[PDB]
């Protein structure tokens, strides 16, 4: 019996079901979106979210008496427990993470996925530079401007806040540096180098993701 | 004269002289976009824009009389026949797609046309996903700030808006983000990883792209 | 005596002579853009500049002498004659292009700037392409929008420049489309797949000039 | 006695401790920039700065010890050198940027900084030749707008900083160009050829790293 619940659990039609299943409740939930649906139907989309959940949670069930410690080793597995967990019980918005499911159950999204997720160890020197970089600035925004500008420097996690938006130029000058400049003339010394700084390590981040991909092709 | 009209229609001054025909058109569209021009010479212009439409209806008639079914499975000719299609009757304006067809015409033109095109099928897994990705943060975010902020967030199709905007950092802080801390405070916390992960991906799409067409060169 | 004007025309210092004199009078156009400087020695920046404007065509008449054609036929001394020509009378300002001598004077400058040039051949079909795009959607928007917003697409320049703007992502949404949508609730269907035409050329123009560059160290 | 100083130096485990230190020191410099913290705890962390300082100034002295020349010719010690000078007297805030230590202290740290740091004299050609454009752009500007618009041009150094922002694309239309235009109309005809060098020209910096880092790999 152990045998047959894992020759039902790992069937191509088991998953091309639970496939099936995932598509007809994202379609759901963007329906749900709609007040108006809701007014008319809002009855029967909740009955159909409910079985939906009890189905993955039975599943997943099965899937643990298939495999006993596997289940837990597996970072797929381990989403997936993880996301129905969560919907089990802002939690009700976050049920809506159950849609990315998708990508663990289809083959193609795991694939590109874990090809996403392998770039990122390669990484790991250059973001931790860029951390205490961030920080450190942080650190000296807040002394410089805090008083100030308390809504943009006031504490360091509104001048994390603020570094991290001229790092993406969104509006780093007329918006930012231009307003300090009227208070405090000699703020561009502070960002200029920064803004240098801080698309340079980009740069270098991309270059690296770059070459390090041919170096596994070549 | 089956072949004699085959020999007509692939002719380089037949090419030439539909190249040379489209090239004068949007000269006549461009000078059409002005009103002062339209009072002295729109009768001129509104009759070369109809001769030039029966010609290019009396050609595409004389190349399926020259290709039966080729011509149906053909990218180009489906493109030209259905531009042709869209100016013989919002619509007024659309006449003017018509210019693409330098593209079809020119050989050059197809050649970077058709090499851009090839790039795309190779990109067809990071979309999905992409895709997926904005859909479940569309679905979040009409339901985290849609009742309190309907011209951002109202719906699902208001919310992809503001979604794809804020991945093209475009005001993303000063006219989305900061205004929604004012109510909701830790609404960054749904934001920054948004971008983080859109940038990312953004990021392996583009080198993606290069290591393919650096493994058809090598 | 030809063979003695050569001699002194092509020796080391005289180049040098010509580069530290470009330096100087870079200095002096810096100094000019003051005010008060030019109270006090503003007497003496012009007739510094009166001095080397006079040598720098002294000095392109002896490279006459001493190359016929060849002079004519090279872009960097095309270059030189066609900026000592320019100041030699907006034209105020445009005798500040002088400066661009210090590229044609250094060989390092030569260096990387032929590199750049050589790089743009391999964009001219990509380039046409987008411009045909441009062009096309210049005229669309022009009609589509022209009359109820004047200012940014009321002719066809105007349209040009706010598309080019677009293409930078420069208040894409907060100042154009979302002012138009306003009106023209559907005004999205226009931008985003221009947005993403758009996008997407420019990468693979990037794209390619990283493999042209590859190809040739390969 | 030299012998036993420099084995002491030289151990893991005097490193691992400087490390220690500065993890701690960052954790207080964090602690810091809050005002209620410093009301209750402002005298410890002050006091555990000091003591700090004292630290890395006797560490530094045992390093000079162990090193005669070598110290001075070595870049990183160099760095911590010139740090632990500015902090043993804006300088309150410059003190902050003993954090960077870690970067001197950690191998990884050093690895992918000095990798960085390498990358830059490949640089060195194009960093000059755009220092040159906008220096030569900025004297334009300053001529051509700088009576009219005191604020972004009045200056050679204010007309640094605008050109700089065009160049980043951060508000160059809505913010600059178009505000222009209403008094010069054809002030496009300066921006856009300058948006479009400088774009180039960025693109070919970052062409030129990524093709220098394949070449140290082939
Ligand atoms: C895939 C491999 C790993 C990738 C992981 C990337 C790691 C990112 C590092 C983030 C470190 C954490 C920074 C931090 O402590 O943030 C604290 C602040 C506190 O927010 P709070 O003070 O509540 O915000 C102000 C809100 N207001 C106006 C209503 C008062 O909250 C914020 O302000 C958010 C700040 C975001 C700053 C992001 C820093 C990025 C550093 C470089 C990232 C990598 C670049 C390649
Ligand atoms: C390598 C660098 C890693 C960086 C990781 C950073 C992660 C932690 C950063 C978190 C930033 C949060 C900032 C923030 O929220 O500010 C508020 C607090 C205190 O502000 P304050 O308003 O005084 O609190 C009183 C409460 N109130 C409102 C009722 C008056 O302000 C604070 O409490 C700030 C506490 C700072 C903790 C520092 C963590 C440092 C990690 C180790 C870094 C080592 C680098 C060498
Ligand atoms: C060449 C290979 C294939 C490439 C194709 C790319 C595929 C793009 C996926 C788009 C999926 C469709 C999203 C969608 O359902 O859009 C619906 C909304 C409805 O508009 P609506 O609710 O009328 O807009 C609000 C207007 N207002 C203020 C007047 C009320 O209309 C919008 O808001 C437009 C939303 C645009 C979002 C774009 C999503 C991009 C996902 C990632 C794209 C690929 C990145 C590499
Ligand atoms: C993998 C993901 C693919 C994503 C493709 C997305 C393409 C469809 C998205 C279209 C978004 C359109 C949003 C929109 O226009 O909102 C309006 C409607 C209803 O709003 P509401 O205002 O209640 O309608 C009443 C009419 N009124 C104004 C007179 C009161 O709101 C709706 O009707 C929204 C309907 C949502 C349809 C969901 C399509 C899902 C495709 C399958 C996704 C599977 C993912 C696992
Ligand atoms: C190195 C190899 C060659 C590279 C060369 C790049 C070629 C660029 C193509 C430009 C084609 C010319 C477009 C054109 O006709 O522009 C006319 C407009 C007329 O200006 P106007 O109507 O006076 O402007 C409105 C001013 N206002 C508010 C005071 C009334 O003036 C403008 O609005 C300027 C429009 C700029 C549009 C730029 C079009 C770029 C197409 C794609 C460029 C290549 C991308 C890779
Ligand atoms: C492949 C495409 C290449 C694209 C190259 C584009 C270069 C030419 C575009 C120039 C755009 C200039 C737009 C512009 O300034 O609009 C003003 C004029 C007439 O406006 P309007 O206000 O009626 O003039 C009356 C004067 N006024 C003010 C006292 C009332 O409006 C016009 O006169 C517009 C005239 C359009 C000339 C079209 C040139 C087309 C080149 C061939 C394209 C073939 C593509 C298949
Ligand atoms: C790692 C290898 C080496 C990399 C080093 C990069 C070299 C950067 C070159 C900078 C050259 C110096 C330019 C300069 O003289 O700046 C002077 C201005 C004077 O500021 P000031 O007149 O006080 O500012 C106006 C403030 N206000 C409103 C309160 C009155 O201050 C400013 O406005 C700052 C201007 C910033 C312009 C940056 C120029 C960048 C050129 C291209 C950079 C390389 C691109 C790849
Ligand atoms: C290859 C190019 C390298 C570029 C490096 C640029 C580094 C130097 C640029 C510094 C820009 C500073 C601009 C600035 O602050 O403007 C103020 C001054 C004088 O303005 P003004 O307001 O008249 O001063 C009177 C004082 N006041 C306020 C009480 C009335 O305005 C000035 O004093 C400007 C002085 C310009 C010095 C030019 C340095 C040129 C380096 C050599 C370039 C050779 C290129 C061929
Ligand atoms: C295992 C991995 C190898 C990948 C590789 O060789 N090529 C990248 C593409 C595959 C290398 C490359 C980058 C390395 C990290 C950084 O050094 C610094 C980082 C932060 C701290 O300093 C502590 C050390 C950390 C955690 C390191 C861990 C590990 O050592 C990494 C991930
Ligand atoms: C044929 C093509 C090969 C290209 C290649 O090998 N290198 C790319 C450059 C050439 C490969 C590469 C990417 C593949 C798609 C993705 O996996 C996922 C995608 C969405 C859904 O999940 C359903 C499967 C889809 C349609 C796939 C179709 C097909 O399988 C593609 C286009
Ligand atoms: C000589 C040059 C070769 C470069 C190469 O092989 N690799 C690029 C890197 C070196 C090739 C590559 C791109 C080519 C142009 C485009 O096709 C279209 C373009 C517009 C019109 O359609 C008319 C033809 C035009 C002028 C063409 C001219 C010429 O034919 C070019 C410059
Ligand atoms: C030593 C270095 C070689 C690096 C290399 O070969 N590949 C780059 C990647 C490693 C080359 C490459 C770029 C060169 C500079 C530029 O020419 C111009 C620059 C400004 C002035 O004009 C004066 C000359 C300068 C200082 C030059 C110095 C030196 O000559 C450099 C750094
Ligand atoms: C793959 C990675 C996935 C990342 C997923 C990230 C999801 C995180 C969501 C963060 C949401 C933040 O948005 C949060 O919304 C709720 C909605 O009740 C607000 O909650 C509350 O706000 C204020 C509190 O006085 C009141 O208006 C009200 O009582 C309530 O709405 C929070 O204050 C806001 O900050
Ligand atoms: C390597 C490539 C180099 C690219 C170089 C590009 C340089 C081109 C400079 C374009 C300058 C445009 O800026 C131009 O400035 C002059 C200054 O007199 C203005 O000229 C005039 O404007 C109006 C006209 O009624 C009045 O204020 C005044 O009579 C006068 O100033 C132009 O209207 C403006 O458009
Ligand atoms: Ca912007």
């Not at 099965?62 to 597995?77: G, Q």
């Not at 159950?105 to 961030?134: D, E, H, Y």
Request: no cysteine.
């Amino acid at each position: 019996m152990y045998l047959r619940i894992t020759n039902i659990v790992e069937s191509s039609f088991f998953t091309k079901f639970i496939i099936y299943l995932i598509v007809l409740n994202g379609i759901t939930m963007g329906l749900e979106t709609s007040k108006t649906f809701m007014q008319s139907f809002g009855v029967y989309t909740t009955l159909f979210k409910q079985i939906v959940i009890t189905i993955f949670t039975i599943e997943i069930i099965l899937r643990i008496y298939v495999h006993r410690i596997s289940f837990f080793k597996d970072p797929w597995s381990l989403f997936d427990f993880f996301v129905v967990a969560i919907s089990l019980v802002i939690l009700r918005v976050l049920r809506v993470l159950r849609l990315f499911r998708l990508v663990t159950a289809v083959p193609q999204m795991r694939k590109i996925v874990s090809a996403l997720i392998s770039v990122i160890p390669g990484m790991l020197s250059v973001i931790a530079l860029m951390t205490l970089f961030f920080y450190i600035f942080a650190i000296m925004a807040t002394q410089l401007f805090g008083e100030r500008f308390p809504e943009w420097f006031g504490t360091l996690g509104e001048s994390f806040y603020t570094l991290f938006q001229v790092m993406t130029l969104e509006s780093w000058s007329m918006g930012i540096v231009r307003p300090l400049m009227e208070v405090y003339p000699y703020a561009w010394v502070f960002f200029i180098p920064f803004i240098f700084v801080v698309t340079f390590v980009m740069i270098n981040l991309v270059v690296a993701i770059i070459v390090d991909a041919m170096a596994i092709l070549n």
